[PDB]
From a paper:
While the EctA and EctB enzymes have amino acid sequence-related counterparts in various biochemical pathways in microorganisms, the ectoine synthase ([name]) is considered the diagnostic enzyme for ectoine production. Crystallographic analysis of the psychrophilic S. alaskensis [name] protein [(Sa)[name]] showed that ectoine synthase is a member of the cupin superfamily. By using an ectoine synthase from the thermo-tolerant bacterium [name], we were able to obtain high-resolution crystal structures of the full-length [name] enzyme in complex with its iron-cofactor, its substrate, and its product. The (Pl)[name] protein is a head-to-tail dimer where backbone interactions between two ß-sheets mediate the contacts between the monomers in the dimer assembly.
To obtain crystals of the (Pl)[name] enzyme with its substrate N-γ-ADABA or its reaction product ectoine, we added these compounds to a final concentration of 40 mM and of 20 mM, respectively, to (Pl)[name] preparations pre-incubated with iron. However, crystallization with this substrate was carried out at pH 4.2, conditions under which the (Pl)[name] protein is practically enzymatically inactive. The substrate N-γ-ADABA was added in large excess (40 mM) to the crystallization solution; however, the obtained crystal structure displayed only a partially bound molecule, which resulted in an occupancy of 68% after refinement. The N-γ-ADABA molecule is coordinated within the active site of the (Pl)[name] enzyme through six direct interactions with residues Trp-21, Arg-25, Asn-38, Thr-40, Tyr-52, and Glu-57. First, a direct interaction occurs between the O atom of the acetyl group of N-γ-ADABA (acetamide oxygen) and the iron co-factor with a distance of 2.6 Å. Notably, Trp-21 adopts a dual conformation in the crystal structure of the (Pl)[name]::Fe/N-γ-ADABA complex, in line with the observed partial occupancy of the crystals with the bound substrate. The comparison of the (Pl)[name]::Fe and the (Pl)[name]::Fe/N-γ-ADABA structures therefore suggests that the presence of the N-γ-ADABA molecule within the substrate-binding site of the ectoine synthase induces the reorientation of the side-chain of Trp-21 to provide additional stabilizing contacts to the N-γ-ADABA molecule. As can be observed in the (Pl)[name]::Fe/N-γ-ADABA structure, the water is replaced by the amide carbonyl group of N-γ-ADABA upon substrate binding. The (Pl)[name]::Fe/N-γ-ADABA structure reveals an extended conformation of the substrate within the catalytic core. The distance between the carbonyl C-atom and the α-amino group of the bound N-γ-ADABA molecule (4.1 Å) is far too large to allow a direct enzymatic attack to initiate ring closure.
Author numbering: 1 to 138
């Protein structure tokens, strides 16, 4: 038996924050289920190029709006209830108009190394600046 809660995972080592996405990992390779499972926020205004050569991924949008553009294929708007699955290891752009909340399943599971390494993802456009600078401790 495994029991977890998103509200425990947030702001913890299983919450991986990147320039375009915050992935809250629910089932890890360690959990032995044969897949990994996460709840990922795709930040508003962002664009990320994605290509998982070594995994298939299912993505189910439960909040927000954006689009996925398949390189050499079509562009599919993303809204709550939209599901896509990359059974052909498709290279794709993932764009968020508003913040998107995505339940994601990977077939072999992703490892912690792969998530930290951002393997298979290339962030291209980050959220608009909030006015902060690294050199402003205030
Ligand atoms: C929604 C999406 O595709 N996020 C990509 C990150 C992925 N969930 C991962 O953990 O590598
Ligand atoms: Fe994806």
């Amino acid at each position: 038996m495994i029991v977890k809660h998103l509200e425990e995972i947030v702001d913890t080592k299983d919450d991986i924050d990147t320039t375009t996405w915050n992935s809250r990992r629910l089932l890890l390779t360690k959990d032995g289920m044969g897949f990994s499972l996460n709840d990922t926020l795709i930040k508003a205004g962002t664009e990320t190029l994605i290509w998982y050569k070594n995994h298939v991924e299912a993505v189910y949008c439960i909040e927000g709006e954006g689009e996925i553009e398949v390189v050499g294929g079509e562009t599919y708007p993303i809204t709550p209830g939209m599901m896509y699955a990359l059974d052909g290891h498709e290279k794709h752009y993932l764009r968020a108009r508003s913040q998107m909340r995505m339940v994601c399943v990977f077939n072999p599971p992703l490892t912690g190394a792969e998530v930290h390494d951002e393997e298979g993802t290339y962030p291209l456009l980050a959220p608009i600046t909030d006015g902060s600078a690294w050199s402003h401790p205030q």
